[PDB]
């Protein structure tokens, strides 16, 4: 906004693990305010991921987030003349938000049976650097690299 008067809102940690990171992931996945449904989906997918891999749910989730998190994005900047796509560094909070949003969108786009299964498959693919939201991170990085010459506007 113009006035710069927006603070921050505290978020309760998730029940099973007490991680605000996972609580934010549940919030992103939630639709129509059905938080219990979102939590059940997330927990089922996390248990499937944990039994697929050798790490805990939090460790596997962190691996997937590390593989999907972007570092530099492109934003439009209009100056005297034409608008340029300037590459800008992404702050850590936005890195996490983008990683979660891309993962959720990719899982929703997948075509498996259940949403929990789709989320588990997407998380495993992210941990192995395959599939969507990983291609999305790659596309964002490619655009930033192509527009690197404009990193002074």
């Amino acid at each position: 906004p113009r006035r710069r008067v927006i603070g921050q809102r505290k978020i309760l940690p998730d029940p099973k693990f007490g991680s605000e990171l996972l609580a934010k992931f549940v919030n992103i996945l939630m639709v129509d305010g059905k938080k219990s449904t979102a939590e059940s989906i997330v927990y089922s997918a996390l248990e499937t991921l944990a039994q697929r891999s050798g790490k805990s749910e939090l460790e596997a989730f962190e691996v997937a987030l590390e593989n999907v998190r972007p570092t530099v994005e492109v934003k439009s900047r209009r100056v005297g003349g034409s608008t340029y796509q300037v590459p800008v560094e992404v702050r850590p909070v936005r890195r996490n938000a983008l990683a979660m949003r891309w993962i959720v969108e990719a899982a929703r786009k997948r075509g498996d049976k259940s949403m929990a299964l789709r989320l588990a498959n997407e998380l495993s693919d992210a941990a192995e650097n395959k599939g969507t939201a990983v291609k999305k991170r790659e596309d964002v990085h490619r655009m930033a690299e192509a527009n690197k010459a404009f990193a002074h506007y």
Binding site: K10, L12, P15, K16, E39
Partner: protein, 129 residues
């Protein structure tokens, strides 16, 4: 730690009366167990939070009656009432409870519907022509 201590909690349209006394850790809400009444893990955590913070979970017995609102509102009202009961029991926990943010009464209520709007703020779809 010899007599009953009382607390009132409120959240949304929920009001909760909390009676606390020394005990072993049994919680009754509306003549039911905590797990019987609150099937939501979030609600269970909200109810348990002050006790976990003060490390007195198994030193007390909880007798709680609630009315109004829904699951989350009743859980929050119970948490507020438990915080007030603990403050009545011992007055040295006020600082830590306020630091955790449990002393504050959450005043967020449902915004009224208004003329010309579909809801509190959602306006009907606009068209120039």
């Amino acid at each position: 730690a010899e007599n009953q201590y009382y607390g009132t909690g409120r959240r949304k349209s929920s009001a909760a009366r909390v009676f606390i006394k020394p005990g072993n850790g049994k919680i009754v809400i509306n003549q039911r167990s905590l797990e019987q009444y609150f099937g939501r893990e979030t609600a269970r955590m909200v109810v348990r939070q002050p006790l976990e913070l003060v490390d007195m979970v198994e030193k007390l017995d909880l007798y709680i009656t609630v009315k109004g609102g829904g699951i989350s509102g009743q859980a929050g009202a119970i948490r507020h009432g438990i915080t007030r009961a603990l403050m009545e029991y011992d007055e040295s926990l006020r600082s830590e409870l306020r630091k955790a943010g449990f002393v504050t009464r959450d005043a967020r209520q449902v915004e009224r519907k208004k003329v010309g709007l579909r809801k509190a703020r959602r306006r009907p779809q606009f068209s120039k022509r």
